Amino acid sequence: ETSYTLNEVVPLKEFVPEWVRIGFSATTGAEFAAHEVLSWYFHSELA
């Protein structure tokens, strides 16, 4: 049922190097929870 969306103009080229690595991070501090990923799909194309 429930969905959430966010959109922003983020000129990526101005912030990140031409080659990058992508992935996931998760942390806990004084409080905690397990963070687990079940599947992942990615596709990119540079003309």
Partner: protein, 181 residues
């Protein structure tokens, strides 16, 4: 043209095409980034570098990614810190934990960071999170203080499917979290 694609539908014990950092490991068909233990970091990165823009040409990449994750906390109030999909320099190693979500080290813009991350933040860090104190989705560019955020109700233990897309023609980055209930 250059294209990079991959999909892992069930992660498995020797998932050699992922780089695991901190406490990330794969277990029981899942990528487990953190266990419900206090104060740890876990990260996982796709093995190949991907070319996101070209200097010769000015061309930036279009991309799309989807993944389903589970945040499993002891109860709905003691949950922290969150989860992130990030894009960083090729040699990125874990940064500050806790509320910095292992990707950043500061609330002020730091051009050296070179990290854009979409976060699913479950803990209100008064020094930089929205004044409503809500759990939230956000886009972080080079700082843990998000340039935009949307409030989100965490359903503890439920799977959430996320799509993040970047349209290079308009530079709009879009993220959708849907709980299948």
């Amino acid at each position: 043209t250059e294209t990079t694609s991959f999909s892992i539908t069930k992660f498995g014990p020797d998932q050699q095409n992922l780089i695991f950092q901190g406490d990330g490991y794969t277990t029981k068909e899942r990528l487990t980034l953190t266990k419900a233990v206090r104060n740890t970091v876990g990260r996982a990165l796709y093995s190949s570098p991907i070319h996101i823009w070209d200097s010769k040409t000015g061309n930036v990449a279009n991309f799309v990614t989807s993944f389903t994750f589970v945040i499993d906390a002891p109860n709905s109030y003691n949950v922290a810190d969150g989860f992130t999909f990030f894009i960083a320099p090729v040699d990125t190693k874990p940064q500050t934990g806790g509320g910095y979500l292992g990707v950043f080290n500061s609330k002020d813009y730091d051009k050296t960071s070179q990290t854009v991350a979409v976060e699913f933040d479950t803990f209100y860090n008064t020094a930089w999170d929205p004044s409503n104190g809500d759990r939230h989705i956000g886009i972080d560019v080079n700082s843990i203080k998000s340039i935009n955020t949307k409030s989100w109700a965490l359903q503890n233990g439920k799977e959430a499917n996320v799509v993040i897309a970047f349209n290079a023609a308009t530079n709009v980055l879009t993220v959708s979290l849907t709980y299948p209930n």
